[PDB]
Amino acid sequence: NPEFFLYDIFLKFCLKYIDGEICHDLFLLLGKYNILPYDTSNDSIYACTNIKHLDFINPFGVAAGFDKNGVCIDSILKLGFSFIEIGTITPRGQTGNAKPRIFRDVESRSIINSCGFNNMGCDKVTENLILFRKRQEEDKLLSKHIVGVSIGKNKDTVNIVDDLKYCINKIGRYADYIAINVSSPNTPGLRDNQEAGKLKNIILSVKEEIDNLEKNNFLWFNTTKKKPLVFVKLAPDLNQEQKKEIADVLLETNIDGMIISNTTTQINDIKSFENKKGGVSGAKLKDISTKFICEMYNYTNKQIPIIASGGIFSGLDALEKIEAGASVCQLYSCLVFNGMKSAVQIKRELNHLLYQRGYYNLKEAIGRKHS
Numbered sequence: 001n002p003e004f005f006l007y008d009i010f011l012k013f014c015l016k017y018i019d020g021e022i023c024h025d026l027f028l029l030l031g032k033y034n035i036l037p038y039d040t041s042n043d044s045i046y047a048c049t050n051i052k053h054l055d056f057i058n059p060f061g062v063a064a065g066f067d068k069n070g071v072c073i074d075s076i077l078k079l080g081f082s083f084i085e086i087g088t089i090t091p092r093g094q095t096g097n098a099k100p101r102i103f104r105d106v107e108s109r110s111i112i113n114s115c116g117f118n119n120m121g122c123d124k125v126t127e128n129l130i131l132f133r134k135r136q137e138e139d140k141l142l143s144k145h146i147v148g149v150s151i152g153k154n155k156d157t158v159n160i161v162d163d164l165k166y167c168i169n170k171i172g173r174y175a176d177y178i179a180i181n182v183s184s185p186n187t188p189g190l191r192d193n194q195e196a197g198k199l200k201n202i203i204l205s206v207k208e209e210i211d212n213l214e215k216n217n218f219l220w221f222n223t224t225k226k227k228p229l230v231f232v233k234l235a236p237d238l239n240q241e242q243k244k245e246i247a248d249v250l251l252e253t254n255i256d257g258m259i260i261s262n263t264t265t266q267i268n269d270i271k272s273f274e275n276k277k278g279g280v281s282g283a284k285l286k287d288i289s290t291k292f293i294c295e296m297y298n299y300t301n302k303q304i305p306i307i308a309s310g311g312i313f314s315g316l317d318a319l320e321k322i323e324a325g326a327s328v329c330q331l332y333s334c335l336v337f338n339g340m341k342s343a344v345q346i347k348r349e350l351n352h353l354l355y356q357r358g359y360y361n362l363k364e365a366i367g368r369k370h371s
């Protein structure tokens with residue numbers, strides 16, 4: 001169904017003549033009224049994966065910033081994804097940086113964005129997630145599907161921890177995991193929070209808040225029925241010293257996983273993006289991103305589970321990430337250039353590769369580039 005030739009003509013048209021953010025908001029509106037195609041495929045028991053008690057039905061999810069407001073959870077998951085990370089949300093809603101702020105280069109399969117955490121705010125998005133969680137009770141088809149929540153700060157917030165605590169206290173209960181966003185290049189100066197000392201306090205404060213949801217306040221209205229796991233999303237634009245210092249902090253603070261990685265500000269060779277501001281995603285991010293997984297997988301001594309992002313388009317791309325050290329993959333740019341067929345196709349390419357490469361299951365491929 002998501003491989004119907006009609007959708008591919010519509011996307012190729014959208015990519016040529018319609019503004020990126022308009023395409024995205026149109027496709028979200030289509031999902032809001034459940035008019036998008038479904039995935040009928042029964043996923044391979046050999047391509048299943050996990051991060052602690054998080055049981056992924058397949059290794060593919062949707063990266064944060066796709067359904068920022070959690071208005072399209074049901075539809076996006078039904079395209080063939082095991083999970084979705086909603087947000088990044090901020091306590092108060094934001095309209096973001098000036099439009100147009102999303103640009104594409106189809107030849108390089110790359111995207112640049114300067115969104116600036118546009119969202120309805122923690123409270124409205126929590127209302128949107130509560131509605132999905134009530135739908136999930138009635139619909140057995142969504143019973144095993146996972147929902148993460150990416151949390152950040154409002155532009156003008158001096159102390160990030162205040163905003164992270166606010167979000168946990170409102171939406172924590174309905175999340176399977178929380179992703180701490182300290183890596184957006186579009187909120188000055190969010191990336192400073194990746195310094196080891198600041199990151200340690202952020203992790204411990206977030207964890208202390210989740211742990212306190214029990215004491216302060218049935219309680220877990222999520223998939224897992226457990227307190228949410230804590231992940232951290234990191235930027236690829238860091239030196240080796242920084243990556244090591246962060247790795248030590250992750251080991252000490254016992255983070256449940258790491259999202260490697262967010263967009264990059266280090267790409268200079270996209271000609272269409274020369275007059276543009278923000279972070280680059282897509283095919284051009286793949287090598288930078290996979291190298292960062294190897295680095296961190298080794299810096300953390302294989303102790304911290306990895307969530308791969310991005311530059312993932314093919315099964316070969318996904319296998320590369322897995323063998324580098326990732327347990328699950330997240331897609332964003334793939335849905336933009338490949339469209340609705342993304343999940344169904346990538347799941348197939350990977351299954352074929354797992355057989356071809358002589359792996360019994362995906363779990364055996366994790367970190368296999370490292371002896």
Ligand SMILES: Cc1cc2nc3c(=O)[nH]c(=O)nc-3n(C[C@H](O)[C@H](O)[C@H](O)COP(=O)(O)O)c2cc1C
Nearest residue numbers: 063064065087088113262281282309310311332333
């Ligand atoms: C328009 C746009 C908005 C994004 N918004 C977010 C966000 O709110 N939070 C976040 O953690 N990442 C955000 N990202 C980053 C993606 O989640 C992903 O990490 C990145 O695009 C790299 O993966 P890709 O090459 O598969 O696109 C955004 C990316 C794009 C293109």
Ligand SMILES: Cc1nc(Nc2ccc(C(F)(F)F)cc2)c2c(C)noc2n1
Nearest residue numbers: 014015020021023024027335336339340
């Ligand atoms: C053509 C196009 N599509 C975009 N978004 C988008 C694509 C597919 C789906 C769907 F899989 F149908 F759910 C949802 C959203 C973006 C974005 C983001 N930026 O430029 C785009 N340009």
Ligand SMILES: O=C(O)c1cc(=O)[nH]c(=O)[nH]1
Nearest residue numbers: 115116117184186263279
């Ligand atoms: O809102 C944004 O612009 C955004 C957030 C994020 O974490 N990454 C990105 O590239 N954009």
